[PDB]
Amino acid sequence: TYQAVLKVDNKVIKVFDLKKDGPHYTYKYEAKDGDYNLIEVDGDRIRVKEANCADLVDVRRGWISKPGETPIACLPHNLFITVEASD
Ligand SMILES: [Zn+2]
């Protein structure tokens, strides 16, 4: 079993459990300045579904689910999603 760690501005703000038979939902990160990234968890996988950064690189990256995968990164918003083991 794995977990996704969402970090923004060097603060870990949310840890999502990645369960194969798990729920499907969205979580919105939105800063006071209007910068936002919409996280979508679908069972055991996670992505940024939508964002308003200038290049949408994190959106275009799509889903990750395994610890070794390159983290989802929105560099303009200083936001990162990495997958890791339940330790
Ligand atoms: Zn981005």
Side-chain angles (χ1 to χ4, degrees), residues 22-31 33-85:
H24 168 220
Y25 56 93
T26 56
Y27 173 93
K28 182 169 69 196
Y29 163 72
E30 188 174 347
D33 65 23
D35 287 359
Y36 83 96
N37 304 76
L38 185 65
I39 285 61
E40 188 185 0
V41 175
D42 180 39
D44 60 4
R45 57 183 192 159
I46 188 166
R47 68 170 176 186
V48 177
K49 183 173 175 180
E50 183 184 319
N52 64 354
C53 56
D55 58 22
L56 303 181
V57 159
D58 49 311
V59 174
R60 292 151 61 195
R61 173 85 171 83
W63 302 101
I64 64 175
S65 68
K66 305 298 181 176
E69 297 195 75
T70 305
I72 296 161
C74 183
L75 300 178
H77 296 174
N78 206 14
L79 174 149
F80 300 86
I81 301 168
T82 195
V83 170
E84 66 185 21

